[PDB]
Amino acid sequence: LKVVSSSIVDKYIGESARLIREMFNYARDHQPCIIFMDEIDAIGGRRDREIQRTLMELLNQMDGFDTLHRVKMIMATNRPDTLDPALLRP
Amino acid sequence: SYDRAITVFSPDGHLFQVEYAQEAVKKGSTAVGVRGRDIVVLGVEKKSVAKLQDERTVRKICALDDNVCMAFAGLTADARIVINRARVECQSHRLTVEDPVTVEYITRYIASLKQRYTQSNGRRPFGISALIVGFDFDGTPRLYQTDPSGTYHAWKANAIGRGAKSVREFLEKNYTDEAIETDDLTIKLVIKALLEVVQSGGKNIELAVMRRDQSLKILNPEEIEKYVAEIEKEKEENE
């Protein structure tokens, strides 16, 4: 799973959070899988509304990782400083 | 580039800190001085003596020469500083110069001291203005005003302080181009304004007089109240 992070963004109300949830559900359904969301800062910048509400859903879906799934994830960015420190937490 | 300093100009080019000094003068009490046919008179208001505050100590009127007299309106600390400097300058000039002091020279001295103090970084200007009356204008009376910009001008009659807007207009209303006969008449005229400015209470008219030949003369509150009663009789005429 390769993602341009700005591709996650959509103008319909709450559609992006559904997109992230469905992406992780497809990840769980089709193991083994690797999720590579690139240019994470696009939806990972420090706390226009929908992007923050979607980063919340990304955080929730990330924390939902049980130890058993064969699912791993890469995020790439050129400006890691702009990234929200929420992601930086172990 | 906003003001924020003493030695910098806004794009208009005016030193706003000098303006702040002149407003610091504006927050002071009234002070109206005049020159008469022969004599110069002064009466200061807003004594507001609060019981244990014995009014003599603050010395609203200071005489610093063999004969010259004025305090300074504004903040009184710089007033007393310029008082000490005026004492030193007048005595030193009288000792060193072949002839004694004249009012023009000492007024230029005060203006130059204010300008020199202002013209530097890290040196607060004297936010004080004064009205100087002196005798040795070749044995004639004349009145000067000094402004924190270090400026000195000559007046027949001037007002500074809280009454500057009002009393000056009062003067513009009634300063007789006729040289004031019976200089006590000029004293009554100035006492009228000095009272009317502060609610005409009759308690803070604290007054000095010098006939351009005499030494310092002072007016006690009862003798000043005499001129006040004459002015009241003059005002009662409208009936």
Binding site: - | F9, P11, D12, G13, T151, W155, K156
Partner: protein, 228 residues
């Protein structure tokens, strides 16, 4: 680039002294004319109230028997510059006994003016006209806070400098008699600057080579008043 002269703009200009020029602009207007007959200067008092002594505002001064001055700006330190000019003339003449060239007097005033970032304050926010006569020529000269200075034939500074300068430029020519120059300058001042002439707000001072006495105009304006 706001703290002082010791900072340069991207275009090099110092963002301190242009404000001193604008400080010239906030002062009362002043005019000067150079003629082969005599050199003349004029100045507006802006007498705040006639209860003041109009002569008290020293906006027109005599440095010496051959040289007079006028200024526009903050005025306060302009008097200091006149003091420097007077001490310059006194010292140089008492030492050398040769007359100070008005060019040299302006040069000395400029040398004083260059003491705000050139040693070890702030520019003197005022401009000056000097009018003088000397054994080699009658001259008029102009001085500004930057310390630069220029010879001019018909000069104007202060508030309303541009319009007065335009009219003065249009009336001038190289062979005018000082009477016609004075009358043209006065009528210009009347039309553009304030109002009809009167003794309590206008000032004129003129100097001629053979006259070391009365470089002023005083108590004789009446003839002009009826015949302007």
């Amino acid at each position: 680039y706001d703290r002082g002269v010791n900072t340069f703009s991207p275009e090099g200009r110092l963002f301190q002294v242009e404000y001193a020029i604008e400080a010239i602009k906030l002062g009362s207007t002043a005019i000067g004319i150079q003629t082969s007959e005599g050199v003349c200067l004029a100045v507006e008092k802006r007498i705040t109230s006639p209860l003041m002594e109009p002569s008290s505002i020293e906006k027109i001064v005599e440095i010496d028997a051959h040289i007079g001055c006028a200024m526009s700006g903050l005025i306060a330190d302009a008097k200091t510059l006149i003091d420097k000019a007077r001490v310059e003339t006194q010292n140089h003449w008492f030492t050398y006994n040769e007359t100070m060239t008005v060019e040299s007097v302006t040069q000395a005033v400029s040398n004083l003016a260059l003491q705000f970032g050139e040693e070890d304050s702030r520019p003197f926010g005022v401009a000056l006209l000097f009018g003088g006569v000397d054994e080699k020529g009658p001259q008029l000269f102009h001085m500004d806070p930057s310390g630069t200075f220029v010879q001019c034939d018909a000069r104007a500074i202060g508030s309303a400098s541009e319009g007065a300068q335009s009219s003065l430029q249009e009336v001038y020519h190289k062979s005018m008699t000082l009477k016609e120059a004075i009358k043209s300058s006065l009528i210009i001042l009347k039309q553009v600057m304030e109002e009809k002439l009167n003794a309590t707000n206008i000032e004129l001072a003129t100097v001629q080579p053979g006259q070391n006495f009365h470089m002023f105009t005083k108590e004789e304006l009446e003839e002009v008043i009826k015949d302007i």
